[PDB]
Design a binder for these strands. Structure first.
Lengths: 191, 100, 62, 75, 141, 144, 19, 56, 67, 142
RNA sequence: UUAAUUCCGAUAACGAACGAGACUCUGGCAUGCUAACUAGUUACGCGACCCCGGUCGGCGUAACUUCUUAGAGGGACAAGUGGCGUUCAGCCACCCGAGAUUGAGCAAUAACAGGUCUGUGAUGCCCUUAGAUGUCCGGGGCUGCACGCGCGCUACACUGACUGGCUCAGCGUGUGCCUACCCUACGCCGGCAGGCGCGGGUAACCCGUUGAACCCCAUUCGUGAUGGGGAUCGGGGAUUGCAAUUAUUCCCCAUGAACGAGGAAUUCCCAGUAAGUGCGGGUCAUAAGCUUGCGUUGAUUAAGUCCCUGCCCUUUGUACACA
């Protein structure tokens, strides 16, 4: 295929990030569209190299946690493949656009932190950068799948498929959107 | 005729001096010589505690001792290279010669 | 109240108790003129964009 | 607090619910059917293999961890 | 044509264990329905005809890498002995199961008590191995 | 085949044992004190029973024949090594013990060591760990 | 000769002799 | 190029001292210490106890 | 963390003042000049000296070098 | 026709893979097995990367015998996908057009660099006072 | 400005020394060099099989050094392009490139009444010295249990347990001086732990191509303190030793405990790193829940700050200098 590279069986062409803020720090189309998430690495060396790592490889990397699931990227990629089948069936349209939309809608844009006048302290609200939007969106939906699957027959590949469908629509059902709106509430509380 | 000289030493450049000496010898006496076969080096490694007593912060010494080995094969009678092998014996390097 | 888009023009320096903000002057994408200083959480570049929930309140130039 | 008393074997009206509701589910897995009908995953799988073999459900791609089916295409 | 290496080995061993069971005359010992396959394993095998699978497994292991005695069969058929509350350790297979499988294949015209120890695969063995390989590949076609 | 058949036994009672019918047979018959996983699997392999069934799908004739093989160890070629009671110090008969019988065996045995006043019995009576286990920093939940 | 010490044990024995 | 003579132990009574006599250049760290600095640690038998000597 | 020490800098300034006419803009040629003219006891030190020589000389032309 | 043999390797980790490229018809086999049978099967496409991108048109002139040793499963898979790709570039400059190699190299290198350049990372040594390279044992106060 | 009293600048200072850096060992690059029947390759001939070819760790000797080994050199320097910088020191990006900070060893001036007299036939003083505080044998003890602390291991499950099948490593050590005591292929008996036979190896030669675990493919299980957990306990069976009771170690059936992710608090760590996962060395007659090394799979977050905790400076005050 010297033509175009499917993600196992999913089409990369005609998948547009509508949000302009998460256009620069989301790498899925034309050049970063690869068959697999599982690649070498060498993103962690420098600062902003993390931004260009395929967003599906970022999802895979974040999905595995809590000791037992450490250095199991082969198990993690097979869960993401199976989830991508399930989000295609349940929804109908492209699984890549499902993931992209879920990540855009899960990303917070205002959150609190402790600020200067270091005499004492102060909790003032600030804006999160488009890379921090991606980072927190992917983390929150990965812990959404983990916490949902833990002690319930609904298998993890199906749990991710629920959380991705929910967040991609902008549900309020998804753990990721609940937590986001909780952060933006506390931001409003102290601004 | 297949005589084999095994040169073994803790020092490398003293081993290479004796090795490069015996090849010069074999070639200037018109003899078939298999070049020095660099057998893998062995690292005698002993790691001790540093303190004689018990009550110092847990620090370890890591003593190493590298031992090096070349062997050079020769197709010749015994007594010619016997006169060569008797020449240029250093304090460091250790020679063992077998006949067949 | 409308969420507004602004392009970060330059990074100034880092503030907060434990150096966990970026003091940056952010120019509005909608109007060419309006540049206000805001504190930014997360790793921010020069030549990216921010989505402001309010377009008026400004950070202190420390 | 709560306890989940799933069936070990089929009831006649639960078997009716299976063979009639499941061929219209766009996602049929042993996890989904076990949640909806209240059955153990062993029976849930055994029924799914029985229904595929009889020729009603449409298999997608199975695995030792995850076995996924869907409804048969109508048009 | 095709050989043993040109087909998926997951289908090959089940095909060969079935092929040997279609013969169904493999000098199978007495204590098959009471024994545990290794002192690192806990239970008896889930399946009842584990002997014909292991006979075919040993057979293709001698095919690929020959000159293998009972001790290398206990090495290759090893796993974790998870020591309960202490951490897990590598442990060997049951010597009896491996020896009796080779003696079964010795009595049958497949292997041979080889010089330099262990068992070879004899031309009749290799033939039956290579022909079923073609049958499995033509089946997966 | 997969429907709960007529007269499916939800509750079984054998050797004063509550075996649930919903359990798979090899882990169903494993319930009683004396029958573990291994002994349950070898005797259900002995009795010509398909171990793929639930513990309620079988018939009472299949129940008695698996109960007989259970109480008849050597009588159906289960060897000396498998038994949970080998060469009893009073009886000298190599045969498995079950719930109420083993309760009698163990109780009599540790009370026998107590009455001969062998240390094992003395450690049993004074309420400490029997097998030379360090008690300087372990065994506090059972002893307040 | 008959005892036939390894190069490792021989070179350590040579070192201890000097020590 | 340079020397260092240390004599340590019970000097001028019961509590012990360390007298340090250096003249010229002396290096302390790195590999060149192996083949430029020649050392010698010794013990001497005096009536109060052991006097330790370190000559560099 | 690439700050050259007094050793590399002083050696560079002494080499240029004595042998200006040989050293040039190319790093590789004046690596070989410094190799010959200066008995430097290690290879990494020779490369760091030669490196700073073809930085000083690449700025002598621009003008007001002080040291 | 005459000799057209070239042996080229690929290392990613302790593992190594060596590919014997030579003229014939298209046949690429690793320790006997075809590329559809080398495990794990989860990394199917990672082995098909140079085939899928260069097309079978470029491969069908020559056959490659890959042989592997050292490292683990993922390591040896990144070793073989490097070994066949490097072997074909080295072949297509030594025996056919230099523009043909320039074409292959630019296509492979711009998809991913690791097809030609080995990742120079190796397992760092352990030091005392800790269970790994950098992690340290638990210090206790009070 | 730097990792740095590291440099550049300012400059009554100029020029230097130790520590820092350099240095040494190791990590990665060479289709270039010198070399290999104790490393292997590509061909070639025979030999087996499937339908000319395919596979061959089946055999055997002509070319060779890519693969393996260890010697010499080469290689990387902020060198090249662009910005910021008193336009200096240098910093940031980007190209070409195997590397654009690999890890450790070493380590100043001086100090502490820090630890060791249970390492020393290093050693002053005191004590004992024949019913010994010496030296040996015989037994017990250092393992003793209402309790409070510290380092660890297995866990609490489905990303999981179980049973099969498939498929990949790197460091090592190996017959003892007295020393007795080695690593083991292969074969028959046995369910297992072992037992009995004949060999190899003092070693790139034999164990050995070190068929490791995780992982990977397919059955069983179905949210139940459950096929999770494996403490505690009975009985029997093997091995070491002169002897295992107070179970040395190992095996088998049996027994099926608290534990639903852990309050106050708190430890370690930024890339082949954390963590998972197994494998050797030390101890060793018996012998890892320790430590010390080695691969294997391989991330989340950060390129910052003095907020907390420490430490070091400069200014300042002092009636303190055993501070």
């Amino acid at each position: 295929t010297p033509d175009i590279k499917l993600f196992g069986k999913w089409s990369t062409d005609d998948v547009q990030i509508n949000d302009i803020s998460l256009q620069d720090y989301i790498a899925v189309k034309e050049k970063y569209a690869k068959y697999l998430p599982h690649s070498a690495g060498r993103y962690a060396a420098k600062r902003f190299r993390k931004a260009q790592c395929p967003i599906v490889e970022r999802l895979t990397n974040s999905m595995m946690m809590h000791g037992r699931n450490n250095g199991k990227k082969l198990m993690t990629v097979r869960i993401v493949k199976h989830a991508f089948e399930i989000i295609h069936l349940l929804t109908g349209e492209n699984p890549l656009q499902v993931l992209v939309n879920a990540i855009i809608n899960s990303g917070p844009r205002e959150d609190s932190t402790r600020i200067g006048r270091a005499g004492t302290v102060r909790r003032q609200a600030v804006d999160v950068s488009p890379l921090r939007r991606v980072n927190q969106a992917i983390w929150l939906l990965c812990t959404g799948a983990r916490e949902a699957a833990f002690r319930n027959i609904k298998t993890i590949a199906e749990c991710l498929a629920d959380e991705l469908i929910n967040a991609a629509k902008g549900s309020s059902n998804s753990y990721a959107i609940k937590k986001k709106d909780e952060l933006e509430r506390v931001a409003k509380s102290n601004r | 005729h297949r005589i084999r000289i095994t040169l073994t030493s803790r020092n490398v450049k003293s081993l290479e001096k004796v090795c490069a000496d015996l090849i010069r010898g074999a070639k200037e006496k018109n003899l078939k010589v298999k070049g020095p076969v660099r057998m893998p080096t062995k690292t005698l490694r002993i790691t001790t505690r540093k303190t004689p007593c018990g009550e110092g912060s847990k620090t370890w010494d890591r003593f190493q001792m590298r031992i090096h080995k070349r062997l050079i094969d020769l197709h010749s009678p015994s007594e010619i290279v016997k006169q060569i092998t008797s020449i240029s014996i250093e304090p460091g390097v250790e020679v063992e010669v077998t006949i067949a | 109240q409308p969420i507004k888009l602004a392009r970060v023009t330059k990074v100034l320096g880092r503030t907060g108790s434990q150096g966990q903000c970026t003091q940056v002057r952010v120019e509005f994408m909608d109007d060419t003129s309006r540049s206000i200083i805001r504190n930014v959480k997360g790793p921010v570049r020069e030549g990216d964009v921010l989505t402001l929930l309010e377009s008026e309140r400004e950070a202190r130039r420390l | 607090r709560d306890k989940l008393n799933n069936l070990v074997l089929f009831d006649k009206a639960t078997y009716d619910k299976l063979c009639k509701e499941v061929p219209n589910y766009k996602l049929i897995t042993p996890a989904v059917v076990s949640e909806r009908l209240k059955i153990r995953g062993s029976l849930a799988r055994a029924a799914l293999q029985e229904l595929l073999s009889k020729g009603l459900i449409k298999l997608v791609s199975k695995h030792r961890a995850q076995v996924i089916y869907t409804r048969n295409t109508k048009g | 044509g095709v050989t043993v290496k040109d087909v998926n080995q997951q289908e090959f061993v089940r095909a060969l264990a079935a092929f040997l069971k279609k013969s169904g005359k493999l000098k199978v010992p007495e204590w098959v329905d009471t024994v545990k396959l290794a002192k690192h394993k806990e239970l008896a095998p889930y399946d009842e005809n584990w002997f014909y699978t292991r006979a075919a497994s040993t057979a293709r292991h001698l095919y690929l890498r020959g000159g293998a005695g009972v001790g290398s069969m206990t090495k290759i058929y090893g796993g974790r002995q998870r020591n309960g509350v202490m951490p897990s350790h590598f442990s060997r297979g049951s010597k009896s199961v491996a020896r009796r499988v080779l003696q079964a294949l010795e009595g049958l015209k497949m292997v041979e008590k080889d010089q330099d120890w262990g068992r070879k695969l004899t031309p009749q063995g290799q033939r039956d191995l290579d022909r079923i390989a073609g049958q499995v590949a033509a089946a997966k076609k | 085949s997969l429907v709960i058949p007529e007269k499916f036994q939800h509750i079984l009672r054998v050797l004063n044992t509550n075996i649930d019918g919903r359990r798979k047979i090899a882990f169903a018959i494993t319930a009683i004190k004396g029958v573990g996983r291994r002994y349950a699997h070898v005797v259900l392999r002995k009795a010509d029973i398909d171990l793929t069934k639930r513990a309620g799908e079988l018939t009472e004739d299949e129940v008695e024949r698996v109960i007989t093989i259970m109480q008849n160890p050597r009588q159906y070629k289960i060897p000396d090594w498998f038994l949970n009671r080998q060469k009893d110090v009073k009886d000298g008969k190599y045969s498995q013990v079950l719930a109420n019988g083993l309760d009698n065996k163990l109780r009599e045995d540790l009370e026998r060591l107590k009455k001969i006043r062998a240390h094992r019995g003395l450690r049993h009576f004074w309420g400490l760990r029997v097998r030379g286990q360090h008690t300087k920093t372990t065994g506090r939940r059972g002893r307040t | 000769m008959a005892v036939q010490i390894s190069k490792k044990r021989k070179f350590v024995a040579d070192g201890i002799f000097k020590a | 190029k340079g020397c260092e003579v240390v004599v340590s132990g019970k000097l001028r009574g019961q509590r012990a001292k360390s007298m340090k006599f250096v003249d010229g250049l002396m290096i302390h760290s790195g590999d060149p210490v192996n083949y430029y600095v020649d050392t010698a640690v010794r013990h001497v038998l005096l009536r109060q106890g052991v006097l330790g000597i370190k000559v560099k | 963390g690439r700050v050259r020490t007094k050793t590399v800098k002083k050696a560079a300034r002494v080499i240029i003042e004595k042998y200006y006419t040989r050293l040039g803009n190319d790093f590789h040629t004046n690596k070989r000049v410094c190799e010959e003219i200066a008995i430097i006891p290690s290879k990494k030190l020779r490369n760091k000296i030669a490196g700073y020589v073809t930085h000083l000389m690449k700025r002598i032309q621009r003008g007001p070098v002080r040291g | 026709g005459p000799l057209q043999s070239v042996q080229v390797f690929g290392r990613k980790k302790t593992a190594t893979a060596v590919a014997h490229c030579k003229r014939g018809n298209g046949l690429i086999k690793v320790n006997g097995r075809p590329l559809e049978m080398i495990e794990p099967r989860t990394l199917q496409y990672k082995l098909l990367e140079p085939v899928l991108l260069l097309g079978k048109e470029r491969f069908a002139g020559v056959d490659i015998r890959v042989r592997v040793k050292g490292g683990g499963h993922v390591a040896q898979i990144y070793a073989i996908r490097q070994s066949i790709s490097k072997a074909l570039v080295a072949y297509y400059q030594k025996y056919v057009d230099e523009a043909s190699k320039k074409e292959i190299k630019d296509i492979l290198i711009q998809y991913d660099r690791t097809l030609l350049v080995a990742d120079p990372r190796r397992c760092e040594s352990k030091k005392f006072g800790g269970p790994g390279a950098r992690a340290r044992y638990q210090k206790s106060y009070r």
